[PDB]
Amino acid sequence: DIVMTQSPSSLAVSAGEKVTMNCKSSQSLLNSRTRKNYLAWYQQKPGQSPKLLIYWASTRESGVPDRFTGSGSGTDFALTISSVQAEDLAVYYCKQSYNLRTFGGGTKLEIKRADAAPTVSIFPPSSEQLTSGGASVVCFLNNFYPKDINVKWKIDGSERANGVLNSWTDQDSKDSTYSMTSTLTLTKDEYERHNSYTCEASHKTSTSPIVKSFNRNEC
Amino acid sequence: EVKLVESGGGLVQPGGSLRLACATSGFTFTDYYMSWVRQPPGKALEWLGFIRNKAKGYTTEYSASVKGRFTISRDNSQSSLYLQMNTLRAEDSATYYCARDHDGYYERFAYWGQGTLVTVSAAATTPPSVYPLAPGSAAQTNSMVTLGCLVKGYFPEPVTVTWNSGSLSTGVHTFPAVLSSDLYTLTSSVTVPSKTWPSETVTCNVAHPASSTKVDKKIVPR
Ligand SMILES: C=CCO[C@]1(C(=O)O)C[C@@H](O)[C@@H](O)[C@@H]([C@H](O)CO[C@]2(C(=O)O)C[C@@H](O)[C@@H](O)[C@@H]([C@H](O)CO)O2)O1
Ligand SMILES: [Zn+2]
Known part of the structure; x- marks a missing residue:
């Protein structure tokens, strides 16, 4: 019954800039006996376990960079990053331990950087997959920014939307780019009725779609 | 160095039970409360419970979302921590973490394991x-x-x-x-x-x- 809320839910900041994120509790976390606020901050980078950054509101855990500062008291707390680095991409959670423990819902910190065009690679179905009756054609759209991007598939010059699934990665911790995979899955029998397989990428960095394709006759 | 390693995660049928384990080394285990925290894929952390240290007689407490349904226990001979889950449902699908908690002084979860993923599905x-x-x-x-x-x-x-x-x-x-x-x-x-x-x-x-x-x-x- 202590409700923790964090603000904003997400935001994007460029390297070098300051970031402020906020944490509110439904009830004071100031313990009268010890005169400390029982409020910790944790950083969870993509695919990793949460790591402790700050506890008792303002105490920085050893080994945490100096650019992280906790502040606040009672029901209102903040985590401020003085100068953002690409590696700071993460979700940041506050947590009370005044009465049992309760996490806030997190603030997702994304990194803004300069626009970048994707590198596009296309791959035909493997002979292993084909022997078993299936045919997946895969296209990677790698290291681009910002996240929005559109892929079009053409089979013998005509567009196909059925059986196309897309998946974006989380932002990269080193270059702040996104990557996306587009997989078109057909049956072997349908795959074999056509020749030209084309993955087309449309991203704000060019009015020209990036086009990669292969021809079944060529292998 | 301090080490925490969860095991036991995997696929379990709706309504079934599953017990997780957390093996620790590299610190004096009985001196620490231990907590379990879970995270549904793409969602926020949720604190579930803790078991106190020796000084406070190893007693347990639970979030309301799991009290009566999950049990925490520890083996102080082997420095191991357990989470027994019963009557599992889809909302319980999550990565479960054990974390080193309070030592009677510090208010922080200083160490966390890599987590183990539980999927509840038929x-x-x-x-x-x-x-x-x-x-x-x-x-x-x-x-x-x-x-x-x-x-x-x-x-x-x-x-x-x-x-x-x-x-x-x-x-x-x-x-x-x-x-x-x-x-x-x-x-x-x-x-x-x-x-x-x-x-x-x-x-x-x-x-x-x-x-x-x-x-x-x-x-x-x-
Ligand atoms: C003031 C009475 C007891 O304080 C101590 C003690 O001196 O024995 C020390 C405190 O640090 C705390 O450990 C309390 C007691 O064990 C309760 O500690 C918890 C708890 O519920 O077990 C957990 C703590 O993290 C914290 O949430 C406290 C809460 O601040 C109430 O004291 O409760 O014992
Ligand atoms: Zn109790």
């Missing part, structure tokens, strides 16, 4: 098909070349993908799995110097712990 375990993604000859003319592995048709999560047993680590993108027809599919790409391939080998190593699957697939020129 679907059957299905091992992945792993297919090589070899670059077209048209795509081998540049400084950098991109290879991949398609890991199709498995259930439950997770799978791991490394390249050359983990020695190729930069320039890798492993894409989040997509679920369809109650099977997951994901792919991974690695981009290397054209110098290195096909002259030196590139192999993706896929494991699917729920079916004890281990696969290496060597990417060969087509």
Whole structure:
């Protein structure tokens, strides 16, 4: 019954800039006996376990960079990053331990950087997959920014939307780019009725779609 | 060094039970409260409970979301911590973490394990098909070349993908799995110097712990 809320839910900041994120509790976390606020901050980078950054509101855990500062008291707390680095991409959670423990819902910190065009690679179905009756054609759209991007598939010059699934990665911790995979899955029998397989990428960095394709006759 | 390692996660039927374990080393175990925290895929952390230290007679407390349904216990002879879950439902699908908690003074979870993923579902375990993604000859003319592995048709999560047993680590993108027809599919790409391939080998190593699957697939020129 202590409700923790964090603000904003997400935001994007460029390297070098300051970031402020906020944490509110439904009830004071100031313990009268010890005169400390029982409020910790944790950083969870993509695919990793949460790591402790700050506890008792303002105490920085050893080994945490100096650019992280906790502040606040009672029901209102903040985590401020003085100068953002690409590696700071993460979700940041506050947590009370005044009465049992309760996490806030997190603030997702994304990194803004300069626009970048994707590198596009296309791959035909493997002979292993084909022997078993299936045919997946895969296209990677790698290291681009910002996240929005559109892929079009053409089979013998005509567009196909059925059986196309897309998946974006989380932002990269080193270059702040996104990557996306587009997989078109057909049956072997349908795959074999056509020749030209084309993955087309449309991203704000060019009015020209990036086009990669292969021809079944060529292998 | 301090070490915490969860085990026991995997697929369990709705209404079933599952016990997780957390093995610790590298600190005086009985001095610490220990907590369990879970995280549904893509969602926020949720604190579930703790068991106190020796000084406070090892008693337990639970969040309201799980009180009466989950039990925490510890083995102080082996420095191990347990979470027994009963009557599992879909909302319980999550990565579960053990974390070192209060030592009677400090208010912080100073250490966390890597977490173990629990999936609550009636679907059957299905091992992945792993297919090589070899670059077209048209795509081998540049400084950098991109290879991949398609890991199709498995259930439950997770799978791991490394390249050359983990020695190729930069320039890798492993894409989040997509679920369809109650099977997951994901792919991974690695981009290397054209110098290195096909002259030196590139192999993706896929494991699917729920079916004890281990696969290496060597990417060969087509
Ligand atoms: C003031 C009475 C007791 O304080 C101590 C003690 O001196 O024995 C020391 C405090 O640090 C705390 O450990 C309390 C007591 O064990 C309760 O500690 C918890 C608890 O519920 O077990 C957990 C703590 O993290 C914190 O949430 C406290 C809460 O501040 C109430 O004291 O409760 O014992
Ligand atoms: Zn009690």
